[PDB]
């Protein structure tokens, strides 16, 4: 009778007590990691601000380090695409409109983005934009399936061998482009954003410089993602 139902409930209660006690330490670890990430973000910002101010004082010019990360959104449909940009868009895992992916800037990937430039809008994402993307529309590829990032255990079970134990570990790994950026960005399913609230410009399919939407907008990608996520 309920003997067994209550028995398995008591066994579950004991096992869950032990599991929660063990997980408490891991959660302390990820808490500490997130605090450290915040400290280093703030420290880096103040260091860069101070360096700019110092260069201003000493009759010099501080040249920023070129950005190492970009967020690329395919804003063009799937019809009438030449084979090479089509293959390039497939290789960025941008196989639908309003699909977004994180790309680490080098030469190979830069020439890739240049090839896909007439069909994408991309830019340099801020930390809050990355956090908002991963929190609301962050999905992982688990056994070729699109799984919501609803618990830190999914991230641990798939990226603990890369020292990613939390959603903030993943966010830090994306933002400050880390030694395991490849694994973290390929594990991330391409973000499937909505259309912008407020629309695009009057005509999308022209460079951002000429009043369109394609190409590099750099810091306005954060506003665009805010519109679309």
């Amino acid at each position: 009778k309920e003997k067994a139902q209550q028995k398995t409930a008591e066994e579950r209660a004991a096992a869950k007590k032990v599991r929660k006690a063990a997980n408490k330490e891991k959660r302390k670890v990820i808490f500490d990691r997130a605090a450290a990430y915040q400290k280093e973000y703030t420290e880096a910002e103040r260091s860069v601000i101070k360096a700019k101010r110092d260069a201003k004082a000493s009759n010099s010019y501080y040249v920023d380090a070129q950005p190492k990360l970009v967020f690329v959104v395919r804003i063009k449909g799937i019809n009438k695409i030449p084979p090479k940009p089509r293959k390039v868009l497939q290789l960025l895992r941008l196989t639908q409109i309003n699909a977004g992916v994180f790309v680490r800037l080098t030469k190979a990937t830069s020439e890739l983005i240049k090839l896909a430039e007439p069909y994408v809008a991309y830019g340099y994402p801020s930390l809050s934009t990355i956090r908002q993307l991963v929190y609301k529309r962050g999905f992982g590829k688990v056994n070729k399936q699109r799984i919501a990032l609803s618990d830190n255990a999914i991230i641990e079970a798939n990226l603990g061998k890369f020292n990613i134990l939390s959603i903030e570990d993943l966010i830090h790994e994306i933002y400050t482009v880390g030694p395991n950026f490849k694994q973290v960005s390929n594990f991330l399913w391409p973000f499937k954003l909505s259309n912008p609230n407020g629309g695009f410009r009057a005509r999308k399919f022209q460079h951002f410089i000429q009043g369109g939407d394609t190409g590099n907008r750099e810091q306005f990608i954060n506003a665009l993602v805010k519109q679309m996520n």
């Binding site: 449909g77 799937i78 019809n79 695409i81 089509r86 868009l89 497939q90 196989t95 639908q96 409109i97």
Partner: protein
Amino acid sequence: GRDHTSKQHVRSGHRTAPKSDNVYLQLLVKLYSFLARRTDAPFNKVILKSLFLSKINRPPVSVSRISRALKQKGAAEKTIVVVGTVTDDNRLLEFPKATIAALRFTAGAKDRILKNGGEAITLDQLALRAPKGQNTLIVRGPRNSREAVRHFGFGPHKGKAPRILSKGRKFERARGRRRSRGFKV
């Protein structure tokens, strides 16, 4: 819309069940579907796939093949597993004492396995004495010896067998098979 990187709605292309409606083969699949799902033993996963194969994909294993497989170093007391029919070979000079598990045995094969002190058991008896296929050895028959394979991939300078009803000097031997009659391919 999606720019598809692979063909959509594609079946795996592997048999997941026998085409046969034999109720007794189904029972054998019943047993190894449970074993492959629950033993972590790679042997049981191979047997489950092999029970699905079609007639041409499970060629007969002669009693001579088993004799040569038992002649491997350190394989004399292994259990021979044949998912199919074991046939006799009257060209053997001698047969050892062996334990053999097969779907079917021919009259000569069962006669020659038991005459030499061996056992001829079915595949369900194997699953009790070797539920993980411990100390087993799977033997497969020749697939490329079929007559139909003779004509596969036929072409010029391919050396395959022509699809022909009669054989002789008057049947597809003159022009294109001979340099004295034009060319030879």
